[PDB]
Short mmCIF file of C-alpha atoms and ligand atoms in Angstrom, two decimals:
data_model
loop_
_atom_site.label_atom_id
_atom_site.label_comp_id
_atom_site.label_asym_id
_atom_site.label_seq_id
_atom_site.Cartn_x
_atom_site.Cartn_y
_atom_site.Cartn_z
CA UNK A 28 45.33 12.07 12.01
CA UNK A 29 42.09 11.36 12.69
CA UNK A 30 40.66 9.04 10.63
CA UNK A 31 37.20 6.81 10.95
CA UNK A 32 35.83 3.76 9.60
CA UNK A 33 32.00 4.10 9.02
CA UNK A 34 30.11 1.28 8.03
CA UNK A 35 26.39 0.74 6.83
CA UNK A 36 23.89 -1.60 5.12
CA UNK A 37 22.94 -0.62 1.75
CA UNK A 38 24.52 -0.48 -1.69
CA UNK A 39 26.85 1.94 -2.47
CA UNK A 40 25.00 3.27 -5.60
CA UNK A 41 21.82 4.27 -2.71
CA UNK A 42 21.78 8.02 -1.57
CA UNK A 43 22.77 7.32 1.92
CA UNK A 44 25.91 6.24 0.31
CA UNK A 45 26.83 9.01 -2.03
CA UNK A 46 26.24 11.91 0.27
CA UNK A 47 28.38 9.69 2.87
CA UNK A 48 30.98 10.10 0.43
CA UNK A 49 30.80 13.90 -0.01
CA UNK A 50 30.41 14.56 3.37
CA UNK A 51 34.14 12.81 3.84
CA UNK A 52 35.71 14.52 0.73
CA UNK A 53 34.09 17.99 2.35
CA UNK A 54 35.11 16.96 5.74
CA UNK A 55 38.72 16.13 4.82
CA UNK A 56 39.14 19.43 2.59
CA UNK A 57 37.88 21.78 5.77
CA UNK A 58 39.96 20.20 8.48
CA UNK A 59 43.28 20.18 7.08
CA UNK A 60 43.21 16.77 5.73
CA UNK A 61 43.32 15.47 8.88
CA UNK A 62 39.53 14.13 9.21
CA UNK A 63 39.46 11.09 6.94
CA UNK A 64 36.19 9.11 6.52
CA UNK A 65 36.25 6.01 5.07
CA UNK A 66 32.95 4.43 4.06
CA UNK A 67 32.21 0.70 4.28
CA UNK A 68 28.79 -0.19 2.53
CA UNK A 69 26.96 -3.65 1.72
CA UNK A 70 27.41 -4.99 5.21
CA UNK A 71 31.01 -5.00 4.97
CA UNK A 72 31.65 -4.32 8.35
CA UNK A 73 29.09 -6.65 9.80
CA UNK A 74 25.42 -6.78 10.28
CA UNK A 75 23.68 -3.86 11.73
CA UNK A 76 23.98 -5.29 15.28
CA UNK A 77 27.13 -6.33 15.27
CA UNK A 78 28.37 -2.75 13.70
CA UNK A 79 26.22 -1.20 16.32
CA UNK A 80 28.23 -3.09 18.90
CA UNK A 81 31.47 -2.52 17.15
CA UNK A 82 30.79 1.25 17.26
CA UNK A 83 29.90 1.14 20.97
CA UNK A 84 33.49 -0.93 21.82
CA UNK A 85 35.20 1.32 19.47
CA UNK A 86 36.38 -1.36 17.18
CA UNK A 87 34.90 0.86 14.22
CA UNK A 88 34.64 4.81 14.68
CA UNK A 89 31.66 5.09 13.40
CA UNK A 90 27.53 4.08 11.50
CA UNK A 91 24.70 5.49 10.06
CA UNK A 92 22.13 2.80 11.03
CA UNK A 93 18.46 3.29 10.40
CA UNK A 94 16.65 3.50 13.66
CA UNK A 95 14.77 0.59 13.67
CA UNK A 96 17.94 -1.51 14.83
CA UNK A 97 18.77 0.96 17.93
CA UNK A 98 15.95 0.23 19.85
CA UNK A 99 17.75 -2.36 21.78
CA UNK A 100 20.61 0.19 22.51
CA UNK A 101 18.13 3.02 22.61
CA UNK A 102 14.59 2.17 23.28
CA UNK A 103 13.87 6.12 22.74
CA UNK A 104 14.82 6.20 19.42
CA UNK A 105 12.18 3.60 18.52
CA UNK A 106 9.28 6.36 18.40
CA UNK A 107 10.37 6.46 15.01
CA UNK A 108 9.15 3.15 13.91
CA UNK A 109 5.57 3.50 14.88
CA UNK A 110 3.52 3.82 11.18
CA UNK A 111 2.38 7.11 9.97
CA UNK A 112 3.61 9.31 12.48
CA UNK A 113 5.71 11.68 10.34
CA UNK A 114 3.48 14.03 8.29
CA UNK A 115 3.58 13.14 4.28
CA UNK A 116 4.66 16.84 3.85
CA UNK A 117 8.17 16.48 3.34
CA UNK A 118 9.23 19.69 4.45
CA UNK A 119 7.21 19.53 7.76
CA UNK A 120 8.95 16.28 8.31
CA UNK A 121 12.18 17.92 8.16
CA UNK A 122 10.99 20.52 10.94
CA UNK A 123 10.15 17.75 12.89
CA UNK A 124 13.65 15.22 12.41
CA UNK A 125 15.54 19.09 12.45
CA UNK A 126 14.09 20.92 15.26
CA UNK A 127 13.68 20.32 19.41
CA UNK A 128 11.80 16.76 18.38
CA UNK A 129 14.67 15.61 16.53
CA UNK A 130 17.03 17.04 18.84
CA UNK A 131 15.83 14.99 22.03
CA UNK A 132 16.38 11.97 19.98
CA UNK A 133 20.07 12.51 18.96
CA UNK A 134 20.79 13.67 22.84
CA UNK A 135 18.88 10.70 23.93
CA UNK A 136 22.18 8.56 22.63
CA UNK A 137 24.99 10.36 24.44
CA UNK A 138 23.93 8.53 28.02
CA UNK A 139 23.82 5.02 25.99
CA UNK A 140 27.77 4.95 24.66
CA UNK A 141 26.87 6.43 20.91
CA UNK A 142 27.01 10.31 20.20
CA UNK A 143 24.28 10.63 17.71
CA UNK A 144 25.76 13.68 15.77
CA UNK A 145 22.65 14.14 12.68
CA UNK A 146 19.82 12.10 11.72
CA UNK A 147 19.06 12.23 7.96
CA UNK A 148 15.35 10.83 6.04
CA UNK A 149 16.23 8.10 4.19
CA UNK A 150 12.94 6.65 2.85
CA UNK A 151 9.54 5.55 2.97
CA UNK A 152 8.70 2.03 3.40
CA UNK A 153 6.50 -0.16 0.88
CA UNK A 154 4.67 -3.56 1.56
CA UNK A 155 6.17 -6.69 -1.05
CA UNK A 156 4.90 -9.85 -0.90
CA UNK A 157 4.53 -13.15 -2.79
CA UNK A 158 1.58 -13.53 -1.77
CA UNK A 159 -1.58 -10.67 -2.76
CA UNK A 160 -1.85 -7.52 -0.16
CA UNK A 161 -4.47 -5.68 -2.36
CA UNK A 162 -6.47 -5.43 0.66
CA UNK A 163 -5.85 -5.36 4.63
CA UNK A 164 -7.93 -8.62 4.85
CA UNK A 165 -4.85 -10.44 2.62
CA UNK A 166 -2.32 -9.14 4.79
CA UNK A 167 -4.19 -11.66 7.47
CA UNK A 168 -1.58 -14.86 8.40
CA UNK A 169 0.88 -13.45 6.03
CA UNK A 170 4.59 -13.43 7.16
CA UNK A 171 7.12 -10.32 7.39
CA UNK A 172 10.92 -10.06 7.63
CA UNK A 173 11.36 -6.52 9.76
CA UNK A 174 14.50 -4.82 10.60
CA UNK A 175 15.00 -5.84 14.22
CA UNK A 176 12.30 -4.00 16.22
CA UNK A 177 10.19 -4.99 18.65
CA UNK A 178 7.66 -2.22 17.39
CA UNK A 179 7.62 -2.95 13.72
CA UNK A 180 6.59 -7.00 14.86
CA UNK A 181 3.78 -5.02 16.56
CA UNK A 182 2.87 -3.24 13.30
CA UNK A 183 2.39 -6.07 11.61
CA UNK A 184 0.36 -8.20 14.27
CA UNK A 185 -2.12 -5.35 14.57
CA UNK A 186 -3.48 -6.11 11.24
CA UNK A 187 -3.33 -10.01 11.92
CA UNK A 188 0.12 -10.88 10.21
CA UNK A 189 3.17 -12.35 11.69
CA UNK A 190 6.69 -11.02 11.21
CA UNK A 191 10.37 -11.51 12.42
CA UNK A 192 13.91 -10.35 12.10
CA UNK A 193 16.61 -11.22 10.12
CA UNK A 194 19.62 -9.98 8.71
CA UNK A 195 19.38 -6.96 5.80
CA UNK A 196 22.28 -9.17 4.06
CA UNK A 197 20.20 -12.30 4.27
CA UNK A 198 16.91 -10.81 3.23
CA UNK A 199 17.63 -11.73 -0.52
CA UNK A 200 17.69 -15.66 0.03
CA UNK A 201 14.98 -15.44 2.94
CA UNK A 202 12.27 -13.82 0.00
CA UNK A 203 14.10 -16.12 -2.70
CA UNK A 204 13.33 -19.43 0.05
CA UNK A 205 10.03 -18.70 1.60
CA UNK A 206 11.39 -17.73 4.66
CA UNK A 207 9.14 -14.94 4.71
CA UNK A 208 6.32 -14.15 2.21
CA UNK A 209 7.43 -10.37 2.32
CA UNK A 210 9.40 -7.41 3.68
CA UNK A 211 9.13 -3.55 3.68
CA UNK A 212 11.36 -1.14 2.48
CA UNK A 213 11.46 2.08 0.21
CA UNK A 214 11.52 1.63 -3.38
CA UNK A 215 14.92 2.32 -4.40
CA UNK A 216 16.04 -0.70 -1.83
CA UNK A 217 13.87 -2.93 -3.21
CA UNK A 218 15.63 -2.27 -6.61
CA UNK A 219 19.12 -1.96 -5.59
CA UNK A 220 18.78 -5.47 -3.56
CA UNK A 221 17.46 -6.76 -6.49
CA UNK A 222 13.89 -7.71 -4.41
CA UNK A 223 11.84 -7.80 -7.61
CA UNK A 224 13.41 -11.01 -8.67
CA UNK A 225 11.69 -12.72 -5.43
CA UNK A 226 8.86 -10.47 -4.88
CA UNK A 227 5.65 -10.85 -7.21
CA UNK A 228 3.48 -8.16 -5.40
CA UNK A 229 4.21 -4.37 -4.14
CA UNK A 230 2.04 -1.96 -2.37
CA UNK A 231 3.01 1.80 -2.81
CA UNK A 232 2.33 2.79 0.63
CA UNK A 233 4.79 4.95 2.50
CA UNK A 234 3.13 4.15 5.95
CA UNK A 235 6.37 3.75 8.10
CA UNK A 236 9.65 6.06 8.36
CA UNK A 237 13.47 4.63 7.23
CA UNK A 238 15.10 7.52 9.31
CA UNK A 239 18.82 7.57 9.32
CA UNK A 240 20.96 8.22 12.42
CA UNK A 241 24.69 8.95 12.00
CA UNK A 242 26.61 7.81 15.16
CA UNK A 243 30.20 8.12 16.10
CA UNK A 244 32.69 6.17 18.74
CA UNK A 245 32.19 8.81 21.76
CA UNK A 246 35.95 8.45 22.59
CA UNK A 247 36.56 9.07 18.49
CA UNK A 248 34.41 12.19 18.53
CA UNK A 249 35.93 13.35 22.04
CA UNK A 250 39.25 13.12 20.61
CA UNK A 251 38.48 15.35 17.65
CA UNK A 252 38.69 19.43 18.24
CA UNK A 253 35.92 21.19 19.18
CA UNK A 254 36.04 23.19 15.46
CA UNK A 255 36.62 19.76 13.52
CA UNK A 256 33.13 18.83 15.56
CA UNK A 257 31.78 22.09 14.50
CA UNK A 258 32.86 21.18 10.69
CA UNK A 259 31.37 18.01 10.86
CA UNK A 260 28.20 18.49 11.97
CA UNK A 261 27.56 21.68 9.86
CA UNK A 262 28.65 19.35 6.77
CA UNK A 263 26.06 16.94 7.00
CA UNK A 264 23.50 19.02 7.65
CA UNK A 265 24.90 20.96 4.48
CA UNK A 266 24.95 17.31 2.01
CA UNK A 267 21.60 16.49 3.34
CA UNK A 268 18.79 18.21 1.04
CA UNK A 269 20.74 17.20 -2.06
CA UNK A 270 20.34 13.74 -0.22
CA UNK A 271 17.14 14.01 -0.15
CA UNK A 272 16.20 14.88 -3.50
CA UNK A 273 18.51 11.96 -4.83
CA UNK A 274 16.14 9.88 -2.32
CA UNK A 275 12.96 11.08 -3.49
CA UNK A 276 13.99 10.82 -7.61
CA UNK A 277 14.98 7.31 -7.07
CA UNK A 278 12.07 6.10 -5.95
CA UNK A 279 10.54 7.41 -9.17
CA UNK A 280 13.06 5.96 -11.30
CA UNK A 281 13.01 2.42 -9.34
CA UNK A 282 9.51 1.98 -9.78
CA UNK A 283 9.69 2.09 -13.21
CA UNK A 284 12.04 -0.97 -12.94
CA UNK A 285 10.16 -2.78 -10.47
CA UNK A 286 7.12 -2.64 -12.79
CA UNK A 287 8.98 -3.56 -15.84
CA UNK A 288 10.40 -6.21 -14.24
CA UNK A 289 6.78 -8.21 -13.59
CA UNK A 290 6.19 -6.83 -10.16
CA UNK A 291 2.58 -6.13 -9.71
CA UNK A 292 2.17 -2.65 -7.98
CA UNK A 293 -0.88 -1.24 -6.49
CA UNK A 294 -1.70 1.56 -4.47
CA UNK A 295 -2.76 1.67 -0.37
CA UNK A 296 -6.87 2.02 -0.57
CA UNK A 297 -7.43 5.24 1.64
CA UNK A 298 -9.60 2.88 3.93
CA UNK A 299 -7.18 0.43 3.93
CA UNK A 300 -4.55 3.09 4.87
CA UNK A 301 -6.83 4.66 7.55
CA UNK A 302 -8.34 1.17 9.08
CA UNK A 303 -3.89 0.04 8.98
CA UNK A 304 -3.22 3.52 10.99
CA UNK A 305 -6.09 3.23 13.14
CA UNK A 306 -5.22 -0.68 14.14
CA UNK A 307 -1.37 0.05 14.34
CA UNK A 308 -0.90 3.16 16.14
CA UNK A 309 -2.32 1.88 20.06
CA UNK A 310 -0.54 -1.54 19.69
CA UNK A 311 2.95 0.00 18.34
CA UNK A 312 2.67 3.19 20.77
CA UNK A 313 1.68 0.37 23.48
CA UNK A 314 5.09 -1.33 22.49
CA UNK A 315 7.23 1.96 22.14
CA UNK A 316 5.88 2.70 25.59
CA UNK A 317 6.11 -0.29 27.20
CA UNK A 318 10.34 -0.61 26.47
CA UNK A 319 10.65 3.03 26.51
CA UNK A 320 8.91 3.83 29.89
CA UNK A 321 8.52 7.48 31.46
CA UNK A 322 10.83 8.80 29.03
CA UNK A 323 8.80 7.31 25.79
CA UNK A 324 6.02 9.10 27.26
CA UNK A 325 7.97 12.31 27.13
CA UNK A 326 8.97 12.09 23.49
CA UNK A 327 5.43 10.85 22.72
CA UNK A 328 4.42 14.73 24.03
CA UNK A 329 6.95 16.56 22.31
CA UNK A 330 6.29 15.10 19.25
CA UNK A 331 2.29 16.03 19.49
CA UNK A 332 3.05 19.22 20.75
CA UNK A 333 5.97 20.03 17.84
CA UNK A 334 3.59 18.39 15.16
CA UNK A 335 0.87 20.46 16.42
CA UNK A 336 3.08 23.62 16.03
CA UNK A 337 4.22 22.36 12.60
CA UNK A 338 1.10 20.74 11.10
O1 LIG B 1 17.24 -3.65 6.86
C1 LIG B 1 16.66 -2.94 5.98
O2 LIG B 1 15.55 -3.28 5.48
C2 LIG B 1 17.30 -1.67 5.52
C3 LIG B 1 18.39 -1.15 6.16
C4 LIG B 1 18.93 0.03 5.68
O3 LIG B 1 19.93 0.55 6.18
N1 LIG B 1 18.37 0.65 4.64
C5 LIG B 1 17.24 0.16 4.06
O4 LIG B 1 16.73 0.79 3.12
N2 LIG B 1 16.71 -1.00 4.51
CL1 LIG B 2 21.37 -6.41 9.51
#
């Protein structure tokens, strides 16, 4: 009766994926069978913009799209882009992307055609190159693919490197070609997309936020009964720490492939990681800012007064 058509990026075998999937099968068994996800992986559907789109028209019901491709629908949203903002405690991140922080950002959709219904963590992100990053100074003339945000080009230029976006589907051939020298993304992408047969060099480094938002069709989720939105949003929120801890372990068990499969990994230098934070954080809150206007500025405060609380 009321079934939706969800699409998203990644492989199936990621953890967005599989707790996609038990969400439905929950969903379906507490509504009376009349809730039916359907899940549409690998870019399926279309690229993230043009699922984005087709979610806004309605042509699809529904997408869980990391945030860094809503800032053109939802400049808000794009707070979550700027490098190390989230605490590395996992838990206090949580409080953060769970509580009145995280709330403003899903009711920041509702006045932009989406109803943002749950946001889940999905990741840390990881510097590859083919060229050497074992410093800051190498990063210097360098070129990045991003995900399509105007604040993660600004991450990048801070520290002297260029970067632009393309297609998650095309990333593959763009590292394979030279299109780009390198990318970021958490581990367990990098292995799933099969990055370590075009990437020579990784940089375990966790110093920006893949942040998953789950949006619905507002005419779909208007047409479903109040208790059927009750059921729904209490069911993701129920699938997501076992998502998380499928997350986390597969970035363990990825590196292990990466490395075995010639990559050379090295760590973030803590004065590399403090000089990055301290270079990227005016120009990418400058950015955030400067598209998100007054309203940037108010999430900017809740989110140093709720970190303060937290942290
Ligand atoms: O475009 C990407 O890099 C990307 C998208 C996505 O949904 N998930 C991910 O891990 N990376
Ligand atoms: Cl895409």
């Amino acid at each position: 009766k009321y079934e939706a058509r969800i699409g998203h990026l990644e492989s199936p075998l990621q953890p967005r994926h599989q707790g996609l999937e038990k969400v439905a099968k929950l969903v379906k068994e507490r509504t009376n069978g009349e809730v039916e996800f359907k899940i549409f992986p690998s870019s399926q559907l279309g690229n993230q913009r043009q699922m984005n789109e087709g979610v806004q028209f309605g042509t699809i019901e529904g997408t869980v799209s990391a945030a860094a491709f809503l800032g053109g629908f939802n400049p808000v949203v794009s707070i979550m882009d700027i490098p190390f903002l989230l605490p590395v405690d996992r838990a206090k991140a949580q409080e953060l992307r769970q509580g009145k922080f995280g709330k403003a950002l899903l009711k920041s959709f509702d006045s932009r055609g989406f109803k943002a219904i749950a946001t889940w963590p999905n990741g840390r992100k990881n510097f590859t190159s083919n060229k050497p990053i074992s410093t800051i100074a190498d990063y210097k003339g360098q070129s990045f693919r991003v995900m399509d945000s105007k604040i993660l080009i600004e991450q990048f230029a801070a520290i002297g490197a260029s970067a632009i976006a393309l297609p998650f589907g095309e990333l593959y051939t763009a590292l394979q070609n030279g299109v780009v020298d390198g990318e970021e993304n958490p581990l367990d992408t990098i292995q799933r997309m099969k990055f370590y047969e075009v990437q020579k060099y990784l940089v375990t480094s966790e110093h920006g936020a893949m942040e998953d938002y789950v949006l619905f069709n507002p005419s779909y989720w208007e047409s479903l009964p109040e208790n059927y939105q009750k059921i729904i949003v209490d069911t993701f929120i129920e699938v997501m720490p076992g998502v998380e801890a499928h997350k986390e372990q597969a970035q363990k068990d990825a590196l292990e492939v990466i490395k075995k499969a010639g990559v050379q990994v090295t760590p973030l230098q803590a004065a590399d990681r403090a000089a990055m934070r301290e270079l990227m954080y005016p120009k990418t809150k400058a950015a955030y800012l400067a598209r998100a206007g007054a309203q940037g500025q108010e999430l900017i405060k809740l989110y140093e007064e709720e970190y303060a609380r937290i942290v």
